Design a protein around this nucleic acid. Structure first.
Ligand SMILES: [Zn+2]
Ligand SMILES: [Zn+2]
Ligand SMILES: [Zn+2]
Lengths: 237, 50, 62, 89, 84, 85, 146
RNA sequence: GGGAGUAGCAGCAUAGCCGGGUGAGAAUCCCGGCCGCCGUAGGGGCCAGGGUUCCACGGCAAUGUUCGUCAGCCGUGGGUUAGUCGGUCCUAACCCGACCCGUAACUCGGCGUCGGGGAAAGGGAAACGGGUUUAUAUUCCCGUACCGCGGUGGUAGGUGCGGCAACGCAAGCCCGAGGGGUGACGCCUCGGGGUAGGCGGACCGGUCCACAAGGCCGGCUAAGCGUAUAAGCCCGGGGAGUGCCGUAAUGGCGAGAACCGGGUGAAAGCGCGAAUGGCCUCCCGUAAGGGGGGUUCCGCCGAUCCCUGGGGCCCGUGAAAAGCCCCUCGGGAACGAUCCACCGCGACCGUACCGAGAACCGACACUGGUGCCCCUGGGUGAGAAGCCUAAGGCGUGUCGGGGGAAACCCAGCCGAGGGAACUCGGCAAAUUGGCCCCGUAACUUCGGGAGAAGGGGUGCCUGCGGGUGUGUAACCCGCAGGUCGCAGUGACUAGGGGGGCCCGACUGUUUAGUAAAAACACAGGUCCCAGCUAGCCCGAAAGGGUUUGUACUGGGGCCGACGCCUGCCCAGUG
């Protein structure tokens, strides 16, 4: 038989790669063999649009003369002064360890293990809620529902991610979607296996129907996992 | 205005020097046993490999 | 179609040029290897036992 | 037109010759004028021109004589005021 | 304007349907109406890019929503972190 | 190269003769591997003259060819007669 | 052969090879001429001449335009374009309003007008109720401003 | 061999005739005149590709769809000149080498580090006019200039000033570091200032024209050096709200307006270059060579070329580095330039010609494709339309002569009286047709339908008025009267229209070479997996794609704009 788009993506061709040369750099915090307790102070100088982030970025100049990119919170001004460390104040744009952060605070850009650089709640519009503070773990509510546990030395940022309310206005045409998907080269347009041929898909035929249940096992081999994968249920409710 | 490299030009120059005919005294010396050679070429019939 | 006309688009840069090591128009110029000797790809020479080119050259038998 | 001269970075112009030929002349484009660091506002006294046009000029015809000539005067006076207000201690 | 029901969406013509055209027009109306600055209190804030707003009168540039300079969650966060 | 090996041949054509008369120029056929400076020396020595300018071109036969202009103190016709023509 | 003579003479006299005349009674003299010097001296002698350009008159169009200025040839049957093309749309507006502002400013300078009245008229002219200086002056001297 | 001295050498651009010559020989080679084709390209320039096809002299066995004294053919001899044009330099997407890990192994596979390459249209030191050759010229000659290294000699300065200010200045040297700017950037739209190019009137010379009136041709000025104002931005004074100031339009102002004065700043123009240059033309013998005259002005249009400023749009944000300029620190010397004058040196390669209805690819001197890649005078006219024409080019989209000389075919024009009776089917053809005014339905997602439909008018001449403008300059807008014709968008240009049904919402894509569709896509609707050392995928492994990413996200399936709706069964397979 023939292959799937699933299967050709895994090789890394220009038809599937990300055009990262078009983007602004990566967004990490600072390495913490440098941030023992010193509570760096910095100044925002620019706010900019990144084609790979679904969120604005902000350029910061520190007292070291070093320049970094952060993810911009909602309501940060060009000219402000943000602090990064354990004893910094509690405001919008300031990065602290979760232990020092009360219960009820909104939070973004959380590290998984202390030192990573920021793994959670970095998409535009998103936030997390602090629930509890033990001596061995902090519980946090993520934008999906999960109540995850983090070690209390992990770092987060206070406030909300800008860019919110992005999916309210419709995409009206197909050329606009062309441009949105050409920015980051997503596969667009999309075909349907039901209207493909039998070499090219587990569905596929002269009749444009599926002749087997769309539910597939988590132990089905590659080339066959198409549809609903390990579906607990289906339907409307 | 044509923008050739020098090695290629030298090779074309050799190719041009070759494409002539046998002199008359070679025929007179061979008694009409040598009258041609395998490298007569016309620019509009048979092309070179640059 | 797929004939007379498409064959007019042959006034672009070639695929192959001459090779310094072998003298044969087989050097793929967008990649840097000869399809005849392996120059640009191997210290040694491209030879094979299903091939008759080097045998013809040296007037050997198959 | 040569292919390089048909590239829209050459600001063509048609010009008549003493012996009646009506030639085409080609020139490169000038840069834009310099801008303040703190405000993004044009600087006065600093002239526009390519390094050719500029290296045939003396120093004092390339920038004003006041300090901080990379800055507009409103920002210059700001930095000077700050310096003097901090030099009290 | 000159038309009754359509606004910014009178450019699409008879195309794309009711819900589409209504949502588009409402959103763009609220975005193109001028907004109050948080630094000078004057109504001159305009959008610059997606997520970025600027006052034409004072020069304050800040980050916000995609089609409005504030979000409900941002308001909540402001209030909560002011309380604590 | 080295003097006395640079110059291969002098030219005798109508163009070259015209230039000898008018511009005070000589025209030579030279080893590809020589430069304007080596040509200058070569002429200076092999003929005991002072040279002003040298211009070069490779031909469509594989031959480097030099147009050589002397200083107005000397005279081309003199050496053209010193040679055959 | 005489292709050579024709081309040399053409690009000597800065002309075309078809605007060139060779005397049909001296072709031997011309053929004996392989150099540029000889062709020059033949040009001088006049065996090879540059011909005069024919030309194209405009004497009928001159009379056409005279009659059009005095008012013929401008009826409905002679038009092919729209009115908004044959006379623009924004051009009209710009020339009109520029005229009006010029006049108001001169009137203000000659003291006939105060700031209040000039401001009111400026605003009405932008609104676009006047359309010409005659309307403007009619309004001004109907109402009590003049 | 017969087919056969036959087909074909037509169709898309139907072109030749008179006179003279050369020559053994002339439908088809040369010179003149007449008649014609192209004319936003069949003209003019130049990539790639080809590679000597270029030039002159001499030839006609063969090639050239005919002849041939011709030739892109054959022979002999020649021809491509750079300090300033381009390569050479910088980086981009990308690639290679070494080390490293894997592989039974490698000329195979790959992450990271290091080093290096990568654009003859991206970035980027510097030259323009005239002449000369059979064939080269921003390359040679004349004339007038400019860059980069190194020097000699003097000054600026080190050890100086003017302005409240913006700013104006010759305003020190060598080394190293750091900062700042420029390089350095999308799509749409508008205004202002200029230029190439064109039009008109006068005048000076030449030519056409029975006189006259009149028409046509010529009336030229490069880089460089020296010179300034727009717009924008700034400085100082001044002291505002039932407001005033302004734009084509947005608009501006106690977070300091009007109003006074000033500063910085483009493309251009001007002056020198430069009149024993270049063009037009009248003369003596006409051969080398000479002589004289003219080289003037006003007014209008005006770009798709150049410069400067506003405004709008993006779930879309429209490269980098080399290099150049300025400032500041830190260190050395006591001398010494980014100013004036003079001198010296500046390597290697390309450089001929076509550039396509004969020089490239298609086996061809192929109606195809590459390249229409860049440019284009007058009239009518909305117009780079079609028609006519100037320049420039061709008569080589390489077989010609005859003729009521037919039938029949290809491409075209008209047809009385009837008007689809023809045919599967109104296929094919015809009708309508530009502009102004009047007037326009059902239905509708209120945006549309709609140029709905239907109707009237339209030339030439003689005049009268209006808009902008200083205008008896220029471009535009209304009306009366007179008259000719079968006909006044007189040719060219230039919609036929309406009423019902099925399918698909739309714009878009598809079977290169029998299917353009009711099939694909689309916006939107819903479902499933995943909290990241995830989920899904490549691979023999190492390692990798989504990932410079993190649930307003990534991936995987079905329906397919909007509107009203989406009912019962979990026994079977999953
Ligand atoms: Zn090889
Ligand atoms: Zn500033
Ligand atoms: Zn503000």
């Amino acid at each position: 038989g023939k292959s799937l788009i699933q299967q050709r993506r895994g090789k890394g061709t220009t038809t599937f790669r990300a055009p990262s040369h078009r983007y602004r750099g990566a967004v990490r915090y600072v390495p913490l063999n440098l941030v023992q307790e010193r509570t760096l102070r910095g100044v925002v100088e620019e706010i900019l649009h990144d084609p790979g982030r679904t969120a604005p970025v902000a350029r910061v100049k520190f007292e070291d003369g070093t320049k970094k990119l952060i993810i911009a919170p909602e309501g940060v001004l060009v000219g402000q002064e943000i602090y990064i460390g354990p004893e910094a104040p509690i405001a919008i744009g300031n990065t602290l360890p979760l232990a020092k952060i009360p219960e009820g605070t909104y939070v973004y850009d959380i590290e998984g293990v202390p030192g990573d650089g920021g793994k959670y709640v970095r998409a535009g519009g998103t936030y997390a809620l602090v629930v509890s503070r033990e001596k061995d773990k902090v519980i946090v509510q993520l934008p999906s529902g999960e109540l995850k546990a983090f070690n209390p030395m992990c770092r987060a940022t206070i406030g909300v991610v800008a860019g919110g309310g992005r999916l309210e206005k419709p995409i009206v045409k197909a050329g606009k979607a062309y441009y949105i998907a050409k920015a980051r080269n997503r596969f667009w347009p999309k075909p349907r296996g039901v209207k493909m041929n039998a070499v090219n898909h587990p569905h596929g035929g002269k009749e444009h129907h599926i002749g087997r249940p769309s539910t597939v096992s988590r132990r089905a081999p590659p080339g066959r996992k198409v549809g609903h994968i390990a579906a607990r249920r289906t339907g409307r409710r | 205005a044509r923008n050739k490299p020098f090695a290629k030009k030298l090779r074309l120059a050799k190719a041009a020097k070759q494409n002539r005919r046998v002199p008359v005294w070679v025929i007179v010396k061979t008694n009409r046993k040598v009258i041609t050679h395998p490298k007569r070429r016309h620019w509009r019939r048979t092309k070179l490999k640059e | 179609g797929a004939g007379t006309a498409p064959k007019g688009k042959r006034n672009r840069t070639p695929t192959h040029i001459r090779c310094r090591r072998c003298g044969r128009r087989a050097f793929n110029v967008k990649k840097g290897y000869c399809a005849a000797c392996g120059f640009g790809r191997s210290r040694r020479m491209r030879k094979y036992s299903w091939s008759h080119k080097w045998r013809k050259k040296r007037n050997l038998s198959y | 037109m040569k292919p390089m001269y048909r590239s829209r970075s050459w600001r063509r112009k048609y010009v008549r010759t003493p012996g009646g030929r009506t030639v085409i002349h080609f020139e490169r484009r000038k840069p834009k004028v310099a801008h303040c660091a703190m405000c993004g506002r044009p600087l006065n006294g600093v002239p526009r021109g390519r390094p050719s046009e500029l290296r045939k000029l003396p120093k004092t015809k390339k920038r004003p004589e006041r300090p901080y000539p990379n800055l507009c005067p409103s920002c210059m006076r700001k930095v000077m005021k700050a310096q003097v207000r901090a030099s009290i201690t | 304007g000159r038309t009754t029901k359509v606004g910014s969406a009178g450019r699409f013509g008879p195309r794309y349907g009711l819900k589409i055209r209504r949502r588009v027009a409402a959103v763009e109306a609220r975005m193109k109406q001028k907004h109050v600055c948080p630094v000078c209190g004057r109504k001159a804030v305009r959008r610059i890019s997606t997520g970025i707003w600027q006052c034409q009168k004072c020069g304050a540039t800040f980050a916000g929503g995609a089609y409005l300079p504030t979000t409900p969650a941002g308001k909540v966060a402001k209030r909560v972190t002011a309380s604590k | 190269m080295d003097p006395y090996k640079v110059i291969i041949r002098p030219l005798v054509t109508e163009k070259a003769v015209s230039l000898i008369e008018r511009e005070n120029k000589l025209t030579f056929i030279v080893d590809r591997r020589a430069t304007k400076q080596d040509i200058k020396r070569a002429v200076e020595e092999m003929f005991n003259v002072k040279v002003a300018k040298v211009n070069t071109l490779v031909t469509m036969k594989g031959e480097k060819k030099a147009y050589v202009k002397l200083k107005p103190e000397y005279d081309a016709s003199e050496i053209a007669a010193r040679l055959g023509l | 052969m005489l292709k050579t003579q024709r081309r040399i003479a053409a690009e000597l006299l800065k002309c075309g090879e078809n605007r060139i005349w060779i005397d049909p009674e001296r072709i031997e003299d011309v053929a004996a001429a392989i150099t540029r010097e000889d062709i020059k001296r033949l040009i001088h002698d006049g065996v090879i001449k540059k011909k005069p350009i024919k030309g194209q008159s405009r004497a009928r169009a001159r009379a056409f335009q005279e009659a059009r200025k005095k008012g013929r040839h401008r009826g409905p049957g002679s038009k092919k374009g729209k009115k908004t093309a044959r006379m623009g749309k924004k051009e009209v507006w710009m020339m009109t309003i520029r005229a009006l502002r010029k006049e108001l400013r001169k009137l203000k300078a000659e003291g006939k007008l105060d700031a209040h009245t000039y401001r009111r008229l400026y605003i009405r002219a932008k609104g676009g109720q006047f359309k010409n200086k005659r309307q403007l002056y009619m309004f001004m001297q109907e109402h009590g401003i003049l």
